[PDB]
Design a protein around this ligand. Structure first.
Ligand SMILES: [Zn+2]
Lengths: 6, 665
């Protein structure tokens, strides 16, 4: 998984 | 047992640096013997039991034992354990290549698929065959000898470069020292929680609970500039050297395999298939966001000229990289009446968690319960047991690591620790996940209050937790989140829509002092804010997607100048000279290389599944939620991404629900 860099 | 939990979680977190190195050598030998046994028997001796079943039984055992050795480098408190885990990750990664570049194992799997009735094995078994052959040809196993050795040599070096890349960002410790006067407009609950230096100044770290509150609230331009400078120059020197080697190695290995560019090599395994469709998706999307970008850039500039006129600051007439987050916050305050520091008073950490779990103990038909005195890697971690509501089947477990600390993972991701596949004895292994985020910490005697974007991240990362637990397959490589990396963000971004419903927020909201809910008209203001600054926020994500494509399609280019090129051409805000953003881009070394477009690509699918199924028949309807759990989460990697979408939507997806949710055509 992971998340966009805010 | 499929209905118990005792003995199914086999993960130990009390390993020492010596025990980690010892288990790495033991796991290599005991797996080398399995691959050698299959690779030593004759080609005419292969069968489903001694070849396919033998490899399938060792992959599930390897990836579970591997987890206890390559995960402490992300959550541990001992730098020696974080060092021993990083070295164990570099050794096991090279072992994965030596076992995958086997010509003997490849020659027998291809002969097994030919001399076997494919209609007699389960549909996932033959998918395991065609995907193993497809994964073998992508390693050049059908190429001549010395070509394979050159590919295997460059893959091993690319393995060490990507691990060192994230190791530099994880172990970064650069901080900044500011005085009370230089931290203007910052609330006192934030300033009183900082380490004070001898000169009566304060210390600021580059973690998310510190960088973002400064870039959104501090009214001193010099403070915001020096913060953005140190944040976009983390490991600028050491990672630029890694990037100047990792990118050419990917080009040389992609053309040895016959592919044009490295972007073409990774795209055929994604739902977008081709790179020409990705650039058409990103260019046509930024075309519609371009009018919104001009309008938002003009309002921010006028917002800056008036503050410089009032506060007496010098006005340069440009929107610098450090002025962005500061004035997008003011646009959220003025045009939508949203105070982030006041909204967090209604979102304490326990009320959000209690409402988040209850939201999915009804939508997906699950039963969550917390474990007391659980075996964890840090005292801040809690363990939960997931059970089916109707059948009582223990589906899996997951941990919660919600607070930042030293040496911890800086971003916010989910980690699949145990798969939900079948064991050699025929039993189903309990799946284990781990939610790792860096939320705000309790200060000023208040509970840990979360901003609305922190709750959006909480719901997002919990989607990967549900996709990991509900996934039940037969093989380890098809379980969990092992889908297309441009599709894995569909189940996570799908759950972000529950943070934008008025009735769903009313269940997630409770004031930390008197328990009063959020005002009715204020829920409307918060829901209406789902498209504030949507132009610049999404344009900046398109810039990252174009740079991700550009660095993998065109060779011999500086990553810093390529990022700055797409900044002033798409976003409109110029990149600060000297700041090397790609040197901090962790996605380029964490499996998202050449596939970062998958975030915006997956949003088209989640919006289409939410507006056409959930929002049409109630977002809390369990009949729709059960379809989503069985057709999207349960198959995992055993089905194609587009096949799971056609089974849930009963049609072909489109940008209809995606465009009107953004305010476009
Ligand atoms: Zn994600």
């Amino acid at each position: 998984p992971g998340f966009s860099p805010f | 047992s499929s209905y118990t939990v005792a003995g199914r979680n086999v993960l130990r977190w009390d390993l020492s640096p010596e025990q980690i190195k010892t288990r790495t050598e033991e796991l290599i030998v005991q797996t080398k013997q399995v691959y050698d046994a299959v690779g030593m028997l004759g080609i005419e001796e292969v069968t489903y039991e001694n070849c396919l079943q033998a490899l399938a039984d060792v992959e599930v055992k390897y990836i579970v034992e591997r987890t206890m050795l390559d995960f402490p480098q992300h959550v541990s408190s001992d730098k020696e354990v974080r060092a021993a885990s990083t070295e164990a990750d570099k050794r096991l990664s090279r072992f994965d290549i030596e076992m995958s570049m086997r010509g003997d194992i490849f020659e027998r799997i291809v002969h097994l698929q030919e001399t076997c009735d494919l209609g007699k094995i389960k549909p996932e078994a033959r998918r395991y065959l065609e995907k193993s052959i497809k994964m073998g040809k992508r390693n050049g196993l059908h190429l001549p000898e010395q070509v394979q050795n050159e590919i295997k040599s460059m893959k091993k070096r690319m393995s060490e470069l990507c691990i060192d890349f994230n190791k530099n960002l994880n172990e970064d410790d650069t901080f900044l020292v500011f005085s009370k006067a230089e931290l203007g407009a910052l609330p006192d609950d934030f300033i009183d929680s900082l380490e004070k230096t001898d000169d009566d100044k304060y210390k600021i770290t580059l973690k998310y609970p510190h960088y973002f509150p400064v870039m959104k609230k501090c009214c001193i331009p010099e403070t915001r500039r020096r913060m953005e400078m140190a944040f976009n120059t983390r490991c600028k020197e050491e990672n630029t050297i890694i990037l100047q080697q990792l990118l050419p190695l990917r080009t040389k290995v992609a053309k040895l395999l016959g592919y044009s560019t490295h972007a073409d090599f990774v795209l055929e395994m994604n739902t977008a298939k081709s790179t020409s469709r990705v650039t058409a998706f990103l260019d046509d999307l930024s075309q519609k966001l371009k009018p919104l970008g001009e309008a938002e850039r003009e309002f921010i500039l006028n917002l800056k000229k008036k503050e410089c006129k009032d506060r007496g600051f010098e006005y340069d007439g440009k929107i610098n990289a450090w002025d962005l987050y500061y004035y997008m916050t003011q646009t959220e305050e003025l045009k939508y009446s949203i105070d982030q520091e006041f909204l967090k008073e209604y979102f304490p950490i326990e009320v959000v968690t209690e409402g988040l779990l209850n939201t999915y103990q009804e939508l997906l038909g699950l039963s969550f319960e917390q474990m007391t005195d659980a075996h964890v890697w840090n005292k801040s971690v809690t363990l939960y047991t997931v059970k089916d509501k109707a059948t009582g089947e223990v589906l899996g477990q997951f941990y919660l690591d919600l607070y930042p600390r030293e040496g911890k993972y800086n971003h916010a991701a989910c980690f699949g620790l145990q798969p939900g596949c079948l064991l050699p004895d025929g039993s189903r292994m309990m799946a284990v996940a781990a939610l790792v985020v860096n939320f705000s910490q309790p200060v000023a005697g208040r509970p840990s209050l979360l901003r609305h974007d922190e709750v959006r991240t909480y719901f997002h990362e919990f989607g990967h937790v549900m996709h990991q637990i509900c996934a039940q397959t037969d093989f380890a490589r098809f379980s969990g989140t092992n889908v297309e990396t441009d599709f894995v963000e569909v189940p996570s971004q799908m759950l972000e829509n529950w943070v934008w419903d008025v009735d769903s927020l009313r269940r997630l909201s409770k004031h930390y002092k008197d328990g009063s809910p959020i005002a009715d008209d204020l829920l409307e203001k918060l829901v209406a804010s789902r498209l504030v600054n949507t132009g610049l926020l999404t344009l900046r994500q398109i810039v990252l997607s174009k740079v991700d494509q550009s660095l993998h399609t065109n060779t011999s280019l500086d990553a810093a100048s390529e990022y700055a090129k797409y900044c002033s051409e798409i976003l409109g805000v110029a990149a600060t000279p000297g700041t090397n953003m790609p040197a901090t881009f962790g996605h380029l070394a964490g499996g998202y290389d050449g596939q970062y477009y998958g975030y915006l690509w997956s949003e088209v699918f989640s919006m289409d599944m939410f507006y056409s199924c959930f929002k049409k028949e109630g977002i809390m309807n369990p009949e729709v939620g059960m379809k989503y759990r069985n057709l999207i989460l349960k198959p995992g990697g055993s089905l194609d991404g587009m096949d799971m979408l056609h089974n849930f939507l009963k049609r072909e997806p489109n940008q209809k629900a995606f465009l009107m949710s953004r305010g476009l055509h």
